[PDB]
Amino acid sequence: KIVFKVNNQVVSLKPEIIVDQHEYKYPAIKDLKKPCITLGKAPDLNKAYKSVLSGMSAAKLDPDDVCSYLAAAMQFFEGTCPEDWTSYGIVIARKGDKITPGSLVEIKRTDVEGNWALTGGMELTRDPTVPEHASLVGLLLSLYRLSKISGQNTGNYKTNIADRIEQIFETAPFVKIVEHHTLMTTHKMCANWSTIPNFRFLAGTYDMFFSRIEHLYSAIRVGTVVTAYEDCSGLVSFTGFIKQINLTAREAILYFFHKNFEEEIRRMFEPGQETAVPHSYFIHFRSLGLSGKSPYSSNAVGHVFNLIHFVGCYMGQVRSLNATVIAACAPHEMSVLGGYLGEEFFGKGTFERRFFRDEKELQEYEAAETRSPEAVYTRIMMNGGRLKRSHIRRYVSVSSNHQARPNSFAEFLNKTYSS
Amino acid sequence: DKIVFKVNNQVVSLKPEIIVDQHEYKYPAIKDLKKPCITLGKAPDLNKAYKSVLSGMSAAKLDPDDVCSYLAAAMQFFEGTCPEDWTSYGIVIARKGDKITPGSLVEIKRTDVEGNWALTGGMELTRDPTVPEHASLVGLLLSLYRLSKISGQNTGNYKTNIADRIEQIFETAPFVKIVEHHTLMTTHKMCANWSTIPNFRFLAGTYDMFFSRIEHLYSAIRVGTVVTAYEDCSGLVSFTGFIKQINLTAREAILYFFHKNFEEEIRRMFEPGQETAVPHSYFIHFRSLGLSGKSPYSSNAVGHVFNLIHFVGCYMGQVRSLNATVIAACAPHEMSVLGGYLGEEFFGKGTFERRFFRDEKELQEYEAAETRSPEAVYTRIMMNGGRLKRSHIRRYVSVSSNHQARPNSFAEFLNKTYSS
Amino acid sequence: GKGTFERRFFRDEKELQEYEAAETR
């Protein structure tokens, strides 16, 4: 039982209390209603384009107006739907029907008119061309990618992505409307634009449409690529882990020898969410207004996540080496398992002859240390659940020969095993 | 079912773990018996059409739809006899001794819709342009497609070298100089995304197909359209190289592929009914033309095979393999181990036999009279338990370290993975 | 450097029961 007893003068028994709570909701859509946001009144579009360009050059933008323009602008982008496109029971778009981003979601317009005010960076006296509209649309969404990317020591990389975005949208099929270095300066005023919910929702809607439908202005995705599989890093690492190790998703979990994995394994593999479906709302469920906090986040699946990347460092994977470890979720214990698991999967492959010249040769081949969960488990038990010196040698050699990031797995490995 | 686990305490729970997936592959075969087509805006008067497009070129003004209609008219200009009968995916294009155009290989349906030819840049040719002048522009326009595709880091100096060669080609006979120098680099800077345009790819491939089969005076236009050939089939292309480097036949090589994963991939790229063996089929340019969807022959589709090929190439020190981008999804560590055993067999060893003799009698005596075999390699792997040998590591390390590792190349993977 | 590890995931219920039928922290 949880009660334990202390002998302070008289004998005393105390129960131990620690606070714990769980709050996980899943993205499946039962009402069969497409995701909706409420925006402002329909814009003048040509004038709405003018207002936001001026605001862009001036680094002052109104989030509500910018959202309203983006909802109106999702009409210029049109393409035919290759196959019937259904997610969570919704028919969205039948094969051969031309569709827009407006087709994936529901935009609710309010009677209230937007400010659509001009600042000082408008040089155009005429109505804008479509490439221009697309260039602005891409630049505005690209703010989302920049807001997310903010963090410590992420500087030269942020400017490099901003330059890459600027190079797009200045060349055909896009026209240069903002000159250079404007995107970085507006980002400084709009660095937390990701938290704005409608802006994120619009970015996901654009990304969904561009992934399924090939278009001339598909480059707009460079802003919205981040919305894809957002806040599902635990699930994504798991799929990568499975494929790099060349194990079946089930067989891999058999190697997870710990009680903690149980809650996490149930959480990330809950049925009814269209994880397998190629173009479902699941891919952008966080961007769109569904589910709230993600159960597939790395913190949500902390033990699994830590074991995946510790094995990744053992195998020299750069992605694992720079990923941030979840400290709450027992990193040391995960690291030990990762060493035993890494030893098994590093430098070893299961090879069998599958191609022969003749059927007879196949028959001759049929007439004819070991990789198994049971083998690894016993080997761990034999060493008393303690890392081997070789495991430690391998971890340190990988971590030390790397530019260890602040809270990365490499830094953890380095700080933990170094003498 | 089968693929399920038991995940609970004080109760029993069975769950199939569900993982992200998003792929299916379309094949290039032509069953409808219809040549790939993009219907074009308006029928053009040749001389008038040239003047606008020459102007647009000089103006760095991008008019893709018009450029496409002009290129179709210019296809009338290039004509040659077909050497032998031309049979493709059930579509036969001409017969031996029959004159043909690039326009005769595909079908363009002409619409009565109007289109906008603007004179934005300076053209001084008051006279009607000569056929060479047309060819010079046509080559310059197509050469944009190649320039758009070659974008990436440290490719600046490379783009410039290619543009200079193209300019030199079209300023020299049989072509005439119409754009002076350094204009091609600047227009490439203006449009670096010409490759994404679908109508542009279609045209480049059509030209490339015509020029490979038919010898012509202006066949040099093929620079810039050469990239369309076997585009997005680098997995297939890599396998072809692999066969040649090791000097084995397609089958013998596949026997060395000792892994279950290769099976799906080998079946995919060698699916029958696609004219891979045919020399001048639509297949070579299937990606560029319309008849394509993703590609069964891309490096990702044949990921395991692709990685094994380049890991072996790295073992043998092929620079191309060292600089290729590894597919992380397709089990690179396991592929690297097989590649080590396969590289060991094929690096520094050859199968040599006497084939030339002084007299027939010597030949008969030779006919009267350690081992390279898949079985021998498989056993060697089995004896070492499927674990990479120390020598394999040493060789991998020596090759990767003494090379300028590119970002996600096989060279980088080898360095990061085996380094102590 | 030490962890308490136990098999918790099995292919079938029968395998689970068998593991239940079967240095010190």
From TrEMBL, chain C:
<comment type="similarity">
    <text>Belongs to the lyssavirus nucleocapsid protein family.</text>
</comment>
<protein>
    <recommendedName>
        <fullName>Nucleoprotein</fullName>
    </recommendedName>
</protein>
